[PDB]
Motif scaffolding. Structure first.
Motif, PDB file in Angstrom:
ATOM      1  N   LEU A  10       6.651  22.617  92.444  1.00 25.48           N
ATOM      2  CA  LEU A  10       5.723  21.525  92.666  1.00 25.48           C
ATOM      3  C   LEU A  10       4.772  21.321  91.498  1.00 25.48           C
ATOM      4  O   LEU A  10       3.708  20.726  91.683  1.00 25.48           O
ATOM      5  CB  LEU A  10       4.939  21.770  93.948  1.00 25.48           C
ATOM      6  CG  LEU A  10       5.798  21.760  95.205  1.00 25.48           C
ATOM      7  CD1 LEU A  10       5.018  22.242  96.378  1.00 25.48           C
ATOM      8  CD2 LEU A  10       6.300  20.366  95.454  1.00 25.48           C
ATOM      9  N   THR A  11       5.111  21.840  90.320  1.00 28.96           N
ATOM     10  CA  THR A  11       4.454  21.423  89.090  1.00 28.96           C
ATOM     11  C   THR A  11       4.654  19.927  88.909  1.00 28.96           C
ATOM     12  O   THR A  11       5.736  19.406  89.162  1.00 28.96           O
ATOM     13  CB  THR A  11       5.047  22.184  87.903  1.00 28.96           C
ATOM     14  OG1 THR A  11       4.890  23.591  88.113  1.00 28.96           O
ATOM     15  CG2 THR A  11       4.374  21.806  86.606  1.00 28.96           C
ATOM     16  N   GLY A  12       3.597  19.217  88.534  1.00 24.79           N
ATOM     17  CA  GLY A  12       3.711  17.795  88.306  1.00 24.79           C
ATOM     18  C   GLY A  12       3.593  16.920  89.535  1.00 24.79           C
ATOM     19  O   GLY A  12       3.486  15.697  89.390  1.00 24.79           O
ATOM     20  N   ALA A  13       3.618  17.489  90.734  1.00 26.33           N
ATOM     21  CA  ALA A  13       3.450  16.721  91.957  1.00 26.33           C
ATOM     22  C   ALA A  13       1.977  16.666  92.318  1.00 26.33           C
ATOM     23  O   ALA A  13       1.318  17.704  92.399  1.00 26.33           O
ATOM     24  CB  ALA A  13       4.247  17.340  93.101  1.00 26.33           C
ATOM     25  N   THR A  14       1.463  15.460  92.538  1.00 24.61           N
ATOM     26  CA  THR A  14       0.039  15.286  92.781  1.00 24.61           C
ATOM     27  C   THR A  14      -0.305  15.702  94.202  1.00 24.61           C
ATOM     28  O   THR A  14       0.333  15.256  95.159  1.00 24.61           O
ATOM     29  CB  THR A  14      -0.372  13.837  92.543  1.00 24.61           C
ATOM     30  OG1 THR A  14       0.025  13.439  91.226  1.00 24.61           O
ATOM     31  CG2 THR A  14      -1.867  13.712  92.632  1.00 24.61           C
ATOM     32  N   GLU A  15      -1.318  16.549  94.341  1.00 26.08           N
ATOM     33  CA  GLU A  15      -1.677  17.102  95.635  1.00 26.08           C
ATOM     34  C   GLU A  15      -2.427  16.087  96.486  1.00 26.08           C
ATOM     35  O   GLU A  15      -3.283  15.349  95.993  1.00 26.08           O
ATOM     36  CB  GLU A  15      -2.530  18.354  95.451  1.00 26.08           C
ATOM     37  CG  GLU A  15      -2.798  19.106  96.733  1.00 26.08           C
ATOM     38  CD  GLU A  15      -3.562  20.369  96.513  1.00 26.08           C
ATOM     39  OE1 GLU A  15      -3.962  20.599  95.365  1.00 26.08           O
ATOM     40  OE2 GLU A  15      -3.748  21.137  97.481  1.00 26.08           O
ATOM     41  N   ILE A  16      -2.095  16.051  97.775  1.00 24.44           N
ATOM     42  CA  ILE A  16      -2.813  15.265  98.771  1.00 24.44           C
ATOM     43  C   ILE A  16      -3.330  16.230  99.827  1.00 24.44           C
ATOM     44  O   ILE A  16      -3.192  17.448  99.680  1.00 24.44           O
ATOM     45  CB  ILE A  16      -1.917  14.184  99.394  1.00 24.44           C
ATOM     46  CG1 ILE A  16      -0.739  14.830 100.117  1.00 24.44           C
ATOM     47  CG2 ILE A  16      -1.419  13.240  98.333  1.00 24.44           C
ATOM     48  CD1 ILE A  16       0.077  13.865 100.927  1.00 24.44           C
ATOM     49  N   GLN A  17      -3.945  15.710 100.884  1.00 24.74           N
ATOM     50  CA  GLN A  17      -4.599  16.547 101.890  1.00 24.74           C
ATOM     51  C   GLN A  17      -4.121  16.164 103.287  1.00 24.74           C
ATOM     52  O   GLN A  17      -4.629  15.210 103.883  1.00 24.74           O
ATOM     53  CB  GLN A  17      -6.113  16.429 101.781  1.00 24.74           C
ATOM     54  CG  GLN A  17      -6.866  17.312 102.749  1.00 24.74           C
ATOM     55  CD  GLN A  17      -8.359  17.220 102.566  1.00 24.74           C
ATOM     56  OE1 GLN A  17      -8.845  16.485 101.708  1.00 24.74           O
ATOM     57  NE2 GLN A  17      -9.102  17.961 103.381  1.00 24.74           N
ATOM     58  N   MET A  18      -3.139  16.896 103.800  1.00 25.57           N
ATOM     59  CA  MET A  18      -2.675  16.750 105.175  1.00 25.57           C
ATOM     60  C   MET A  18      -3.238  17.888 106.021  1.00 25.57           C
ATOM     61  O   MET A  18      -2.534  18.826 106.387  1.00 25.57           O
ATOM     62  CB  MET A  18      -1.149  16.736 105.219  1.00 25.57           C
ATOM     63  CG  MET A  18      -0.515  15.535 104.552  1.00 25.57           C
ATOM     64  SD  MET A  18       1.274  15.684 104.465  1.00 25.57           S
ATOM     65  CE  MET A  18       1.700  15.563 106.195  1.00 25.57           C
TER      66      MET A  18
END
Lengths: 72, 49, 49, 72
Positions: free
Chosen positions: C16-24
């Motif tokens: 998950l390098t490069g994947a932008t984090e969201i908040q679930m």
């Protein structure tokens, strides 16, 4: 991460098979081809770049396979 | 903010691709390798001549 | 013989390098991206004339 | 395994930083540079094999960079 540098080409092997024989022997040859069938644009454009610079056919095929290999 | 990265166990199980498994849950027993040997059979009778 | 192959939690935190984090966590709150907005300004009183 | 094909080129990038910006931007380069300093004979051999193919200096440099970069 630690999941790279996978302890392959450093000798020490015998008749007994390793931790992953027949599993970690074709996994670098599947995900390249999966990346080709899921990203054809760098394959055509890498074929054009390899065909451009390179005089013989062996150098064009060599730079084509190498440029195909260095991308994930 | 500072977050932990998680268990690196499966990544290490794919890091050992090409590492001959031994066992040390009771002892330290290896089951790979070789040893050179000079088999010297001077006084080896037949038992039945 | 069979063995299972650990946890890919840490092995996927590298994936998950490069994947932008969201908040679930309580509602799927994202904090990524843009939003194009045409803004028309023909009813803005100036509050000070 | 899953730690390969690490989700880099997909589009989808914004002004916000990603999960591993600056912890994955230079791990590949220092990974192959710590690979060369522990296996130099492939760098000498890839140098002399890339020198004798591709009879211009840029094809020699390109095949040297690619043949070094393929081997993890």
């Amino acid at each position: 991460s630690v999941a790279l540098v996978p302890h392959v080409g450093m000798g020490l092997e015998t008749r007994t098979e390793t931790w992953m024989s027949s599993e970690g022997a074709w996994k670098h040859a599947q995900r390249i081809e999966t990346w080709i069938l899921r990203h054809p644009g760098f394959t055509i454009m890498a074929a054009i770049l390899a065909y451009t610079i390179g005089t013989t056919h062996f150098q064009r095929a060599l730079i084509f396979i190498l440029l195909t290999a260095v991308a994930p | 903010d500072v977050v932990v990265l998680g268990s690196q166990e499966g990544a290490m199980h794919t890091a050992l691709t090409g590492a001959t498994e031994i066992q040390m849950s009771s002892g330290n027993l290896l089951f790979t390798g070789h040893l050179k040997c000079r088999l010297r059979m001077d006084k080896l009778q037949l038992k039945g001549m």
